[PDB]
A paper describes a structure:
A 60-kDa FAD-dependent oxidoreductase, AIF allosterically switches between two distinct redox states. NADH binding by the oxidized AIF monomer reduces its FAD cofactor at a centralized active site, allosterically disrupting hydrogen bond networks to release a 50-residue surface loop (C-loop) and stimulate dimerization at the AIF surface. Oxidized NAD+ and reduced FADH– form a long-lived charge-transfer complex (CTC), which stabilizes and maintains the reduced dimeric state of AIF. NADH-activated AIF dimers support import of OXPHOS subunits by CHCHD4 and are critical for mitochondrial function.
To understand how SAXS CX1 and CX2 chemotypes engage AIF and enable dimerization, we crystallized select fragment hits with the W196A dimer-permissive mutant and wild-type AIF. Crystal structures of the W196A mutant bound to CX1 fragments and the underlying 4-aminoquinoline (4AQ) scaffold revealed that these scaffolds localize to the NADH active site, mirroring the native NADH ligand, as do CX1 and CX2 scaffolds bound to the wild-type protein. To accommodate this amine interaction, the aromatic side chain of F482 must rotate out of the binding site. Aligned with this, AIF structures with CX1 and CX2 ligands exhibiting partial occupancy indicate mixed orientations of the F482 aromatic ring. Crystallographic complexes of CX1 and CX2 fragments with AIF(W196A) (C12, D3 and D1) or wild-type AIF (C9, C11 and D7) reveal stabilizing active site contacts and sources of steric interference that correlate with AIF dimerization rates. By contrast, methyl substitution at position 3 (fragments C9 and C11) and methoxy substitution at position 6 (fragment D7) slow allosteric transition. Introducing methyl at position 3 for fluorinated analogs C9 and C11 prevents formation of a C12-like fluorine-π contact, as the methyl (C9) or amine (C11) of the rotated scaffold will clash with L311 on the opposite side of the active site. In their observed orientation, the methyl substitutions interfere with aromatic edge contacts to F482 and H454, which presumably slows stimulated AIF dimerization.
Author numbering: 127 to 182, 185 to 509, 560 to 611, 616 to 619
Write the structure that this text describes.
Amino acid sequence: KAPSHVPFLLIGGGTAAFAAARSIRARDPGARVLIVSEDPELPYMRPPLSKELWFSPNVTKTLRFKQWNGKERSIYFQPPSFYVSAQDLPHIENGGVAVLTGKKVVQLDVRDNMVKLNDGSQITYEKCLIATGGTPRSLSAIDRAGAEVKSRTTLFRKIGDFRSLEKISREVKSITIIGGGFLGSELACALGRKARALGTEVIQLFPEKGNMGKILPEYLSNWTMEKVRREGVKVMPNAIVQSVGVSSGKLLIKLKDGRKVETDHIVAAVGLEPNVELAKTGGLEIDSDFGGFRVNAELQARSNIWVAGDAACFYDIKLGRRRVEHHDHAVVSGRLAGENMTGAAKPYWHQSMFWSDLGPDVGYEAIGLVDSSLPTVGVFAYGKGVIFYLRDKVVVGIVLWNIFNRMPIARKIIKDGEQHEDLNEVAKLFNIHVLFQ
Ligand SMILES: Cc1cc2nc3c(=O)[nH]c(=O)nc-3n(C[C@H](O)[C@H](O)[C@H](O)COP(=O)(O)OP(=O)(O)OC[C@H]3O[C@@H](n4cnc5c(N)ncnc54)[C@H](O)[C@@H]3O)c2cc1C
Ligand SMILES: Cc1cc(N)c2cccc(F)c2n1
């Protein structure tokens, strides 16, 4: 199936790879692009897997969802008709984009511009993108628990995880989410909606004082925790898991503070590990501070190799070295890498945003360096507001709380890098007419 040579080779079949393929085809008409994906699915977007796909009846099979406005669409970036087969990729007139599903790149040879797949086949390339993303982390307490505890613990990232968990929500009476970040909180609201209708139980526990405490200031994290609780979720903050075992057919979670939680299924949402296995054979540098492949401002690692998406630790000329795990960042960085694979030599400049919805009622957007450890200034009108994240009297990140269609304004504030004497006047740019943390 796989051709022996391809001009553009993209490793990984996710958001960053698809955005690069589209970018290569737009900037280089007639380009021949091969995506190698270890997953069996064609490229698809992940945000709906914890949101819109849960707020729909045949959705598990169709994988179509209604945006909050009402317009329906598919989770796949393009229908299969958009792609061509890998075998025919060298011969089709005006080229195309092919995906080799079910195949993993296991070896990378930078000197000879060659990769080896898990089935032994070898592919040479002229330009290559590493877009391998990451794999969910698991808790040490779950790893040492046993095969039964591990078989009843879900690490949520893929279409298969959505389907297996959606079925579980219709079979068991109690599901426990471990993790207070974006993913855990969105799954809590999603599973909580399903549980109100079926009369089941949803628990969310995490070590922080409130949901997304590592990201939002304490007061807003606490407000968010109460919103999640009003969705029918039992939220247990300040919870550190000591051990997990099976007791009377149920899962028993023992916390360090002495509390105990009985449940039927566990969903672990405790972060991501960048997929950097190819750095060994490839001789590529990994970043010990942020993880991931270390690349420069143009997302380049070596002469004919770029890295994009969750796996790329890059140099932001304005904000410094970073690694970002956002859907839009994978789109922006994948697109940029694609342009640089066709001669652009452009640095990461356009700042990608992220968003989170805890239902169709609570939503927030964000841009830049967003970290609750940074000094923050929040101007609210509760209901809505804007939180500025500061570094040396300069706004380096913004969180928009239930304020939409104003991300271009936030993007400009980060870019301009002004020293603002009155942030209440800057908040007026977001139609907000003050808390510190
Ligand atoms: C459930 C969920 C909800 C999310 N919601 C949001 C949201 O609301 N807002 C937001 O901003 N972000 C959200 N994100 C984050 C966003 O989805 C990620 O930032 C984005 O998917 C990263 O794209 P990527 O291309 O870098 O990696 P991935 O999408 O992970 O793609 C990597 C692909 O490469 C494959 N691969 C890995 N190694 C190899 C190899 N050696 N050979 C072949 N293939 C390989 C992997 O199997 C995977 O198929 C969400 C993520 C998840 C999981
Ligand atoms: C930056 C970001 C924002 C989200 N809303 C999100 C939701 C689920 C899983 C994730 F990894 C997420 N990451």
